[model samples]
Target: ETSGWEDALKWLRENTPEYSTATSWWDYGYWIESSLLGQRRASADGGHARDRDHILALFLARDGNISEVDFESWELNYFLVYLNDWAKFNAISYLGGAITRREYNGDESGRGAVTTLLPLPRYGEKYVNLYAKVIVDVSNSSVKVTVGDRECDPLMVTFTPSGKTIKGTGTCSDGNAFPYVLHLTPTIGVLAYYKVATANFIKLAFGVPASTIPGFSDKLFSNFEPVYESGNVIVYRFTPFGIYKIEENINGTWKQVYNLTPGKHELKLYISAFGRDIENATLYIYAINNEKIIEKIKIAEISHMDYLNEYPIAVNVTLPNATSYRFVLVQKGPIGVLLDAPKVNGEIRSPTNILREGESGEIELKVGVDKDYTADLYLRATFIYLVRKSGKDNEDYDAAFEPQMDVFFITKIGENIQLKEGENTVKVRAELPEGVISSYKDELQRKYGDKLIIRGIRVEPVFIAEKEYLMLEVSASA
Candidate 1:
């Protein structure tokens, strides 16, 4: 049979003009160039698998809602299957169908990988299954598909190719006769929260590179440095070639100020409190928007204390949209609760996020300047929900905090910091004595009385990176 997409290509080229040619494939610039060189095109599968996947990526990003595609030619079926499966994995995973725990190999080769999905996040009462493994010997290829960890028919396929095109028949299998029913498709619905950044997903193709970047090339996954990493921030400037990540201990809770923009963004949090049995340690996770609690979901009592083990049991949440989200974590009893880092979606990775004995921490913020000036940056609260660098969330705002008064620690104590545009890492702790709280009442606070967010303050210099950057280590002691 001839290429099944000769006509569809015509339709797509006209509607989605960015993908203007019928011969365009997704091999960086492979397909577009050959098609440009006037190479003879005589493949039975019409278009390449990469081409199809490229379309799917575009479609997914643009909000297309298609479950599966019908393969018009069996000659192209196997190739399509491989990509179709990959696309589905992304779709399902995006729908929250993640492999929570990794299971070990059943036998002696003893090596293994993920084989299924948990109905819901094991962190709470959750969400499903689908996985495959491809085995190959130099000349031929084979693949095994599983549903709920049991062998099953797969949507993704493994194939051997000739002339870089798929041909011939592909097989399918599943553990359950009713495989579709057995597999739980995650809930693809409106998010209670939305991601904060979507405007910067750098897209590049053959000729569509980021023209401004020097010696520019294809968009492989990458980063555009000078990053602000936090439990509630998602960095999205990765491009091709390689990434320049400003990572390492660049970890801590997200400073709510980036609530600078308003849009749906992702937020991640790790919570553990109340005697830590987890079974008895019930914790509430709230999304504070504009100083009001909009949505709150709690982690309930579990079947067992060790249900999730020692790993930080995380809370997966959506921000509903906007910058400056105000969130708080709540639990009862005299428990040694620790709210680790509040992870935002899209962050690459970070250190263990945790706060102890009511003592939280701090991260540096960016500021601009034409010249250095002595200034005490006053980070104040608008209404009643105060702040205390608590690793994760805020409850009574000042809950569990020590030295119950108006106070804050600056990297350098007893001085107004001299700052410059590039050299400014001002670590201001919010605290002082209750009397000091009374002093800054109108100056740094609006919540009034004992609601003071600053109690005692001290600042000290730590490390200086570039002469333009002053790094200070400040502690928000409880």
Candidate 2:
């Protein structure tokens, strides 16, 4: 028996242009590379599964979003799949994080009980059989398949062995019309029909071509187009990538604005492509510090096709006061991004006066310099106490330090703090918790009398603008 691997490789070498890359299961990577010589190359190999997860994800992708999968960087041109891939689907599903083997295969006991049935063109037109996990029934002129009580009236049903249409001609049961159906040859006289999921690797690789499957003739599945097919081997051409541009609404006009204040605003996106218009896209905003990504704090996405009836899709988002931030648009391909940092300069100072132990009084914080700023402020204080360690001879005493309390302690002040240029004074109602300094001082004095040293409580007043933070400390003694 001849496998289609050699045939596909020969066709790929003779037909495809030079430097073209093929994406497939890593097992075929080396064979594809060696067979095609310099005419075509493989993106990844079995020696390492670096691109295995990515290729599997593309096959298992249900939303048709290929932005996260970087096909351009790899210069990928073709997607290859063989007949035996159906046997390897369990491993692919495990690696792709899509469906589990149990979900797709059901139980080994079949849909119900396995039984023998006569061939087609029998005397009666009505027949029903529960074989291979799905219900296949033929009544009058309709051939119906059922999946967990949900009846699907296929547009066409073809008997595999003879390649003949058993039934169906387009018109189906209202909303239950499915893509297509395949009747497998009788297994030990038990004939069963396989129900395939649309757009999945199984259907795209082993079943019918997506273009011939009606309702899928629109702009859907534009990323991979079936260019060649021989037996079970299908070679798909990767479509050209697209570019996206974003603009913000300012003063009732639309324009590109890189630097933005920390607030909410409306933005619009436009897609430029050679294949088709992008139906949906996701916007990812990441916060950066010191040339490294800190976190993805915000996401603003848009889904539209006919809602706007045109280009320039709109979405609303709130900007954060990131030291530096960048934005990415995920659609058909990679789009250019914007990186900008909002400037903030200022100093925070608290009262330097002393306070008694357990003092219940107001604390004043002064803000100076920069433009107007608004944020919630937190006041924190740390207490350090001296500790005496006895010497080995029990005669000498060594000193060390231990923390009494250290953490964020919110002040009973107005949650919202507004600061303007120059100088601003804000008073916060605060109560020094018990044993701040008095208790430590009394205990240390008893152990080392005049040698006892006291340190004041260090206070910090910090302001946050999602957070453009400014902090300062002061020694407040008891």
Candidate 3:
């Protein structure tokens, strides 16, 4: 505030004589004080300042010596300082500006300058400035991994980035009326890229074949456990438990434990449950960054478990540009899993699987990425159906004969026989909406339950990626 007219004289030394005018000194000095640090003079002046314009004539006035040429000298300079350290952010002067100077340490470099750019038009021989920036390579994602529940012929299959071919075959009732006639094998995945189920039976071995549909005969005490025979590896189970929390390891450690953002990093997840009931459940994922929810999504039809009587669930998300997430349980449905900790071995149990009937499941909110990522995967699946036709009465079919069998298949991602890079094709060929299927399956059972001979179905799982499936979540470090 105390700078006198002489100060402007010293600033004139820097090569610009045009600015050394004689009349503007007081204007510079007078205004400088009033604009800075709260002043005592401002306390009194506001109430009784001389009519501002009249008072200003005495402090500083224009003269033949003060010309417009003099003003440009410090124009950009003063504007520079008032901007609070302008060098921290880089700029691109498009209307014909230049990159004078800049230096930035490893820190928050903002969105830079350009907000959007249009595509290049043909110049006959070349294109517009071909410059592009991306948080991730969307079209360049890894291959399809083995996420679906498997249960078919085994063959170390081969997978290509675009697609791979698997050799498989199937028969009618003799082989278990699989949804498809011929199947593919993604088993024997070289890098452990194959998936399959152990043993998950959903029906009570009722003496009547007529009772297997519409939920294995809704008999309150009809205890029935499944016994699967995968060669010598026979097993009994309740949805293969594979519950995990999603996370991305940006840099090397847990820099920040909470609020999540997006970008390139090693995505990581914590398997929270010991034997989680991810069986036939769905997940709702999200991206909350920069203090807002940037992306919200529903990852349904995941089959991470071996769902015998029900559907299966599995998640195939490639953060695109995310790094924070975790895992959990649901209160209103089967697996947010209620409390996934509860279990049974088919002998005796407690607090039964907290599955709520049509409540079907629960969708959670965990106000919750980068690629070159290849994936070890085999798209495998299993399904079972009654061996009879539709009828309305009990004993309409042979009660002594087995009425259901298991069928399995495998395929490559992006659809063919191998993992394709582009969004070529998905694994589950006929996967419809989970909600519609869930409700309609019951109707099918009720309508055809009695004579459900040749109409049995054993649905396992065929988990493909969610919407952004073309990309992968794998790391090149491997």
Candidate 4:
């Protein structure tokens, strides 16, 4: 007898079982709800809703009336319904349950009338249902109902008992009608459901999708390659090796750049890569400004060597007027390489040229300047001992004296001097230490009688053949 309505109601119960109450009019309450109910019921009855707890819970709890059921169970359903309504009104259609409705009409003819259900204002164990009543008067041609802005969906309709109520029913070309006749002994309730458009429903179904982007990795050589160009600031990355502090020369003065400076500026990089005791590492910088390229000079190859051969790299700068400049060794090898504990000595003359023994005579030691021009002489003496033998005739008699003279006792006449250009004379008188000379003279006289007269001595200058010389002449008259 009612195939279409029954089918629709059954579908509504299956899809939107939460709204499938005897009190909710599937055909007359709200077309939006009916449409939503139709889709939900179809899915639910087809067993799709059974696969989802939210769907089953929403359907079962919505239409389940608390007034006729166990108060506790009904209150629980009521709470669920309220939660669902909040979710739906906020466009969260996925929340379980439907907007609840309250009956405002007592007669079957007015069975379509429904009111928006309100939550129990006060918390209690007992179940209570609330509804809104809107009054309308058709006789005075006054009809008004609260229709919230597009942001809100009207949830109820009302009419006064003194006037005929306008029941929204019938079919139009747009597929729905409003303002049909219904009796309102006191008032009639109208029901509306929150709109659950596909956009809102989809939003409610899924939270914001996760982002899909990428991130960056840490750089390995962060502190590498500091360049110092004019007016350029320096920055460096810290590594386990340690931070490098660098300085660059600007104009004529040196400036410390907290980080690395770019370009071919003379830079001193101090490294704390090692610990406090051994933490000195240096890098020589070769750099270019425009391209921002920097090359560090290898320490093992340069610093440990005795000398470094530096080549001038051309730097073409545009600032302070275009000019060409180069860096040269303003300082030599490391300081103090030669100052640690040195040994020095001097000799009066080399080769012992000044001393003659046996016959009392003087020999001259030539002193001259060598390559490094300062002249200072040091002298020490060792004497050769001698013995003299004599006879009256060639083989007539022979006589000998014991060891007579020791040269170690000879006096050193001169030590150190600045030589005058022509000839510097050192005179040595052959006087023996104590009475040795007298004894030697007596022995000579006894051996040869008066014929053994001591001949006058000769002084000869011993010259170094390899050295170029100004002439030196020696004479002995006494």
Candidate 5:
């Protein structure tokens, strides 16, 4: 009954504040607002007009520049990006208008790729599925996409359905390796593949921070922080933060003022809500002179909890007489808005621990607390296999696949356990049974066994408590 989608949705309900708003693609609008399962309020849905362009425009903002669009008016708290959205890029590019489908989907002729084929192309064969203005022949060993009289191999090829990547067979004369991706909708038996540009818009789906991508100016999205990441889903908080009200101290009484006179000025900036997991970020005092210059600056980076202790942060700035001045609070990095989760306050005994082939050992979890307390702990084990390539004979294993092994256990170790006020200890068994690895190995082997060998396995044990989760990996060699 539960899957990645449900896991993320449930997390949203439990972690985020109620009555907050969310903006996502129109496809998930219904899923976000269905009466029985919706957690947060959806800003746009099938019922809303022009939701498509707005939602797509934001997601497909290639340059990361979204200044013209006003997301503030909606009073949004969260924005979502999912792995599945990668498959629906056609509709996104079609309507957004900022970019084209050809830029994303890679139809060399600017026409759409074939989505449904009556006669399926053989998996390991070439020149089969085609509406044929530009023909793409995908074979096991090589990828040759023929357009007009020109033919060249792609730089890289990936099957999006399984998230598998393959190195393309040959070199292009222009020295450009067009990265290609293919996706197949199982229900309708639609096979779609084409040249795909490495656009930054799709990077959010992989949980990449928006700040790291270009075009997302700090002055604009300083308050638009990433709040949650569940591998498949990433949520960003859109609570715009700035100097809502600035006041200057005149003699003894504080007076609200906007314009600052020439020279040194003592001021107080009233920030709406100040919270972050990071230590701090810089707050700049900007002026649009010949080139925009920072006349004064302050270090406003405070811990998530520390911000609550201080209100109306104090600052001193010296401004020039002719410069038009402004203040911007920039928080540069990924920050989560998690609440009230108890700290684990511990670590595994061996810092660099790796469980190699046929190796099993006991690792102790040392816990520390200020006072006696009982809380639930969810322990999850994930197995990552190293696959050389899609159709490799395993000459030297190089590719990798993170086939999730959702072996979850909860407790003091399994159930809640009472801990003393000071320190406590618990031991965890780290092992990979033959059957456990074989179960997943068998499934993958059924498909690509001959082409590749799963050289080793990486066991990641995630310790999930209330607001935080600890990560520990045990690598195993075959």
Candidate 6:
């Protein structure tokens, strides 16, 4: 197998021709001589140094050729370098081997050791099932696979290492399926020439679920690169018209708001750019008060695209005096979406005047008035109808009166008084014309039963006060 270091260094030398000079070698030695050499001397005296230098010379001397000593030396040195770098960076050191056999020495105590296995290459998708066996002696102890804070349960007996194939059947602690899918991509090359006393590699991994994993490193995928864009409002422009949906949680219920009130509200906007649901994007918004806010405000920026574009976004805001409201906008074509905080435009006023009550004249009645009054006298109307029945519909009808028609008596204190002074007499009155009352009675009798009973009289009194006013009351008797 080819050495990773040799491949890496060769790539660097070819890509970065400037690092071919002997001066570039000084920086590489500085790191090795100052940092690594001292550690090796302390661990195994000069013997470790002899072994490491011997291996490094084998590869470098042959111009990056692979040999038995070169390969072994590369493995040992690479592991040591990895451990040293991990220690310096405060990361955990991983052991490079698979479990072989476990023997219980006795007294519930024994020394357990693992055997080194050849590094396997992942070729094509078809080789994802080759299994390598690992035997574990669980007579008195246990073993586990520790990946960061997560620890896999100890498997009893022996097990084989298969290609990294994850079945959808295993369950995650979160009740999700085990062997979650992951996509690894290359962002940076694995090997590069020395430059400015530093050797660097660029790599990136993708298809990694943000829920299962938080971060990734270059060791897994060498050609990975991270692209970054910075701005207050990050816009992602998409081709073709797609369906956009906005979801929000108000109080405790989740709902979709389309017609938003002219105030502030919060929401979550999910955008599907390519009309494909697989590549969707999500964003969250905090407090927003659209009533007093402006439109087309910048919120954030996105990378990997040119031109300023708007995102179908979700935001939360507080609206002024808003009972409950939210808003959502969906574009069906290649569109630029934007969210603007709306400001209230005009003022709202209440009704001009309100009626309080009416007072008593010969019969005193309390009268209350409100502001914006137009007149002082309050106007009231009264009408009386008699019940009659019609054979056509078999329904009750009101009959009209004749002669003087309905009586018209003004209920005001002194305006139309026909009573003696200080005499408390409640007067009844009508306001319609005499002929109108007669016609109404005829229509009522035709629709109602044969009995001609007075429905009641509506009396409207005109009260004269500092504020123009009118009070009307209707009373009935059989």
Residue 360 of model 1: what lDDT? 27
- Candidate 2 off by > 4 Å: 32-51, 61-63, 66-68, 101-139, 144-196, 206-217, 242-478
Model 3 lowest lDDT segment of ten: 193-202
- For residue 426, model 6's alpha carbon misses the true position, in angstroms, by 99
**What CA RMSD would you report for each candidate?**
25.7, 25.1, 37.7, 54.3, 22.5, 38.9
TM-score against truth, every candidate: 0.18, 0.34, 0.17, 0.14, 0.34, 0.17
Better of 1 and 4 by TM-score: 1
TM-score of 1: 0.18
Q: Which stretches of candidate 6 lie over 4 Å from their true place?
A: 1-7, 17-110, 114-211, 214-223, 226-478
Candidate 3 error regions (>4 Å) = 1-162, 165-324, 327-329, 334-387, 390-478
For candidate 1, write residues 121-236 as lDDT tens digits. Answer: 11111211212222111123332333333444333221112212222122234322321111111221000001100101111110112122232211122212212221211122
Better of 1 and 2 by lDDT: 2
lDDT assessment of candidate 3 = 0.24
User: Candidate 2, after superposition: displacement of residue 137 in Å?
Assistant: 5.4
Cα-based lDDT at residue 135, candidate 5: 48
**TM-score for model 4?**
0.14
Error of 1 at 212 (Å): 37
* Predicted candidate 5 versus true structure: per-residue lDDT over 107-143, tens digit per residue: 5455533221121234434433344434456545455
* lDDT of each residue in 1-478, candidate 6, tens digit only: 3213233333333442121111111123234433644422111111122223322222121110011121210111111122112111100000100011121111223443211111112333211112332121122323222222343222111112212322223233344322212221122101111110011111111122111111111111111112121111111111222223445577877686443454545655543222112112221122234432222222222232211122444456543333222222121101000011111112221111011123222222222222222222222332333222222221311111110113332323234332222212223322323344345556656754454444443333333322110010111111
Candidate 2 lDDT, 1-478, residue by residue in tens:
3356656656766786433456666546455556554422222221223333434444442213321233432335677766556555544543343332233344354422111111222223433343334455555535665544566554556543455565553333446434444343332111212222233564455343322344232223334557777666777766432223457798899987544455686877543332223336555655555656667644645564432123555667675555655554445321110011111122222222223446555555544424455656544443433232322322222211111222334353435677655556666665556765555456557866643334345444445432211011111111
Candidate with best lDDT:
2
Q: In order, what lDDT does every prediction score?
A: 0.25, 0.43, 0.24, 0.25, 0.42, 0.23
Worst 10 residues of 6 by lDDT: 90-99
The local lDDT score (0 to 100) that residue 365 gets in candidate 5 is 47
